[PDB]
Symmetry: C5
Subunit: 236 residues, 5 copies
């Protein structure tokens, strides 16, 4: 009558509350894994295809033309629209260093927002893996405390009577560790994957800033080369 | 006579001091939650309305006109007044890169001050969730130490006499964990929410710096275009 | 004979050394509090008065005139002398962006030095609150180890003889926690206050950099406006 | 029958699963050491030879000529090709500050990628050294819990029967510490070595940015000196 | 026969290996202290003398003349040679902002290298203070595990026989704490001192960058003032 289910239904009210809290923490842990690791791996494999497509680009217009047929909910099309949007909001503004600083500002704001939305379940995983051995420890401290209350109320010296109480308490601490260890492991995996992915988003943003800077620079050079002849037709 | 209230009033002076200290830590924990989480959520929903209002702005003057009817104790009106204030303190100063660097300096100072005032109760929550299992542990170490003193003073070997002492001690450590676990959980929640909100404040500050930079840039361009005709009337 | 003083004088040599080490850690903890929290609060209330005085300044010369009557060992007068000192070391240097970058460099060096001298006792508080439960744990491990040596040397089975040994050991671990918990609490308080104060010092430094930048900018503008007439009298 | 192998085969199903999980964590620990510490030391000794070769360089063309005969899978040739590649992508772009900012951008992206690929096994080592005492602790908690279930099912008071159960449990926690301690030690070693190596990669990148900046600067100076004679033939 | 040396020679093979590993960790701890704290304090007192000598400098040439008679293995002479070396490598390069950015780049690379070579033993101290209570804990877990094996092999119920086993185990954990606590204390001391010293090296580097920037600025100004007369003799 002392199986893993046997011990749970033979437990106290507070110990059962601790145990179903730890089981719900485990359900949330594995659900965060199978429902956001799937989205993370899908987004990694999507940005890899977009990164390989835009890796042959030589201007921002070729990158926008290659990004016309990307996914609707992508990243590279969002960053390319920010760069191009800034180029049209700052049209009839001749300060190209301004456009570069403002685009770098919008893209680091956008990359920061994207990377923040990536790690949503990380707070849950960090809190579960941090507090779950304490919730299991509270379960076993309450179990042993009720065992000592049961040994003080009734003058009973032997341990074969108070042993299922100690076993239920220890079950609560074991379940605490079972809810804790995938929390930390999955958190670590996610941290690695998310850093990989935020390096990819930073790489695509880098690419957009280098294609916009190179275009602005080359355009400014051609314009200068044509305007020198006008300068020497005006100052003469 | 050994209920949760029964054990407290049957405890020592130091153990009762530990227990009411942990209960006051729990009262402060839940009061920080229900009285600053309310202010944080109110400020989040207020900056969201102001962010949606100013998201259609094309200059700093349209943003100031849309922000004239904002809340008195807002953020977006404060940041917009810093930007506009700098524009009038640095009137008759032709260095526009200067105004942009000084406004970015004032706004990062203001955003830093606002974000510092946001996390006020965080020090309390971090200290309570860090030291509360130690205060519970001091309570149980003193409980077992007084139990061993009671077992050394009177030659009493059985455990049915010294068991309420050990139970009171264990109550102190359980209460330590109950004061500890919402401290860490609420700290984590608050950290997430506060990062969300400090990203929103950073976004509004970003917007103000991009509307002021774009205006200064466009103005400098128009002024330059008009002064070229004066240049060719002066240098001829 | 087993009071808190009774147990100490009835202890071993190593256990008494652990206990007076923990009492000296507690004396240092409360002395760091009452002798540097007083200096921190005095400096906070002094920089608040200087911040309110200089908040009505419109140039660096008005700020220096208002800071002539400040405290000798202040901060705002030191930072204002750095700014003004740089303005006279870089006299007959026409590069104003140079003066701004060099002043920002000296002031961040000075602010860093001031903020480093602020947190002096923080290393003591962090080390005491980190190692003090370990020193208490070493005391109780040596106490129980000597208790087991005493139970192995003399074939004595009952616990009413070996109980004051275990109580002295547990006293060492309780004293470890008492020396540990104000170390962490006071460290946290100090960290908060010191961040508050280093934000104030950063605000005053910010003010000095914005008053020096605005003055240099406005001066450069007036000089340019006067030199344009000389330019058009020279190039004609 | 209670040797280290004797205890394992006499254990439970969950305790044996814990033990082979800890042995596989130890195999992965020592394999990460002997198969990536070898690659790290090989890469350190290779970048040292390339650093000594390029330390006598005075331009980017001499560094490229000395790097023609480097290893195929090197670092210095990759960074030198980025610098030279940027110099040819931004050919017919006269903004040299642009080329310097874009090269610094590509090289910090490349250095970041290289340093990220260096620390691959670090996530494994950090997770193993963090969760391995907990997996050993889960093993011993399950061992003692099954021991108490065995002492509650059969009314058996003496400890000479339940002692191999407690010994198997303790074996699981010792094995937990054995899988944990080389995880942290090797992680620390690797962290040191990887910081050493990422300082070397940062030094080579620094060198490439200083050779490209000095060349661009010196070229711009010579070009300016020749164009001054053309200026006085155009403005005359 | 149960003195501190008595217990060690009466121990197991694994427990003696744990104990001599902890004694060698203690020897390394105190040797890192007395052989690198001496070098740190010598370097602190040497940079203080050089800082007081160069604090009266008004150019980089006066600082080089005052640094000609410094120690051979110093810091200030190294940083001053970097600044002067850059000034001669970038001779016949008129871009002074270039020289300032490249010198700041070399000096932050050099300061980073010096500060990295300062904290050599820090990895040893951090690893010893982190893993040493675990190595002591492995020693006591193996000691109690062998005690339970000895109580399971021979049906022996009393504790006066198994007590030296538990005492040897506890000795291993006490020695673990003795090797651990100076590791953390000395690490903390070193961290403080090294931050003090890396602030001094940063201050000297700051000084070198401010003396080189001021010299370049003042030179550029004088050159401009002389070249204006040539400009008005050329453009006339
Ligand atoms: C074990 C238990 C683990 C619980 C883990 C809690 C810690 C991590 C929680 C992080 C997520 C919750 C959160 O507060 O953040 C969201 C914001 O959440 C809120 O607005 C606040 C809800 C907080 C409600 C908490 C009430 C109860 C707190 C009880 C605490 C003590 C329990 C004991 C994120 O904001 P967003 O910008 O991403 O918004 C988009 C999305 O729609 C939101 O999901
Ligand atoms: C469990 C116990 C938890 C106690 C938590 C203490 C740690 C976190 C405390 C942070 C807040 C207190 C603080 O020092 O900060 C305020 C400044 O507080 C002070 O000026 C210093 C008061 C400190 C008094 C401490 C005296 C007793 C310390 C006993 C410690 C040992 C106890 C054992 C903030 O200044 P402000 O600029 O934000 O102004 C707003 C307003 O003043 C907020 O109060
Ligand atoms: C519990 C015990 C807690 C001990 C806490 C020690 C850790 C934190 C110590 C930090 C302060 C000591 C320190 O090393 O820093 C000062 C510099 O100190 C030294 O020069 C080095 C003295 C170190 C002597 C240590 C010798 C014994 C170490 C035994 C360690 C193991 C003990 C077990 C700061 O220099 P400063 O530039 O700020 O100048 C101001 C004034 O000089 C302050 O003293
Ligand atoms: C003890 C157990 C220790 C386990 C340690 C796990 C934590 C650290 C894991 C880090 C490496 C795995 C990882 O996720 O990162 C790689 C990316 O991995 C993935 O794409 C995701 C695979 C994750 C699969 C996890 C599934 C099971 C998770 C079970 C967790 C709970 C177990 C209990 C790296 O990507 P990359 O850009 O460097 O590409 C190179 C190459 O692909 C290297 O693999
Ligand atoms: C308790 C035991 C504590 C052991 C502490 C180990 C962790 C910290 C070790 C840091 C120093 C060792 C190191 O790897 O770094 C040096 C580089 O060391 C190496 O090249 C790698 C040697 C590593 C060999 C490790 C082999 C055995 C590892 C067994 C680990 C598990 C033990 C259990 C530093 O590089 P450098 O640039 O400063 O070079 C200059 C100087 O000449 C070097 O000292």
């Amino acid at each position: 009558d002392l199986s893993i289910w046997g011990m749970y239904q033979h437990a106290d009210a507070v110990v059962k509350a601790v145990m179903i809290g730890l089981v719900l923490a485990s359900i949330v842990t594995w659900t965060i894994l199978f429902a956001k690791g799937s989205e993370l791996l899908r987004a990694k494999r999507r940005l890899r295809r977009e990164q390989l497509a835009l890796a042959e680009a030589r201007s921002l217009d070729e990158a926008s033309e290659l990004a016309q047929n990307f996914s609707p909910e992508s990243v590279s099309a969002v960053l390319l629209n920010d760069a191009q949007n800034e180029l049209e909001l700052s049209a009839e503004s001749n300060d190209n260093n301004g456009i570069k600083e403002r685009t770098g500002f919008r893209l680091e704001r956008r990359v920061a927002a994207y990377s923040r939305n990536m790690g949503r379940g990380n707070g849950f995983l960090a809190t579960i893996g941090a507090i779950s051995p304490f919730v299991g420890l509270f379960g076993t401290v309450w179990g042993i405390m009720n065992s000592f209350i049961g040994i003080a109320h009734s003058q009973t010296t032997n341990l074969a009577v108070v042993a299922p109480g100690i076993a239920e308490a220890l079950l609560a601490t074991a379940m605490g560790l079972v809810a804790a260890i995938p929390a930390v492991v999955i958190y670590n995996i996610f941290a690695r994957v998310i850093s990989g992915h935020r390096a990819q988003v930073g790489d695509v943003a880098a690419q957009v800033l280098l294609l916009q800077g190179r275009d602005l620079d080359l355009a400014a050079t051609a314009e200068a080369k044509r305007s020198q002849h006008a300068h020497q037709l005006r100052a003469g």
